[PDB]
Design a protein around this nucleic acid. Structure first.
Length: 93
RNA sequence: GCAGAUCUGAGCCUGGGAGCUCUCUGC
């Protein structure tokens, strides 16, 4: 899937390491992405099979923008993160 | 209904994974 996106509060990360427990994955994504700004939630959706996908919802769009740029392709648990803006913002105002 | 659960529950769809349904648990 290669959808048209535009900046919003939420980034979509895939190519994550599927061997990492979901609770540890959430804590590690929080620790590394909180440098860019306040995080409202981190979602790791349950899929029929493990697929290495997560969403990080930032309080400010600028935080998402800087995280997307800075962390694109960066190793996380020995795999390069692939990052996009979310197709549809997951923030709940 | 809401929230969770599978490399540690399942059937599909897909066949270059942001898909669907079920089952189970709590409320």
């Amino acid at each position: 899937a290669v959808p048209e996106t535009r900046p919003n509060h939420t980034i979509y990360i895939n190519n994550l390491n599927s061997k990492i427990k979901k609770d540890e994955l959430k804590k590690s994504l929080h620790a590394i992405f909180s440098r860019f700004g306040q995080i409202l939630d981190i979602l790791v959706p349950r899929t029929r099979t493990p697929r290495g996908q997560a969403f990080v919802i930032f309080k400010e769009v600028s935080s998402a923008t800087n995280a997307l740029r800075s962390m694109q392709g960066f190793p996380f648990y020995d795999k390069p993160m692939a990052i996009q803006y979310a197709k549809t913002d997951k923030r709940i105002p």
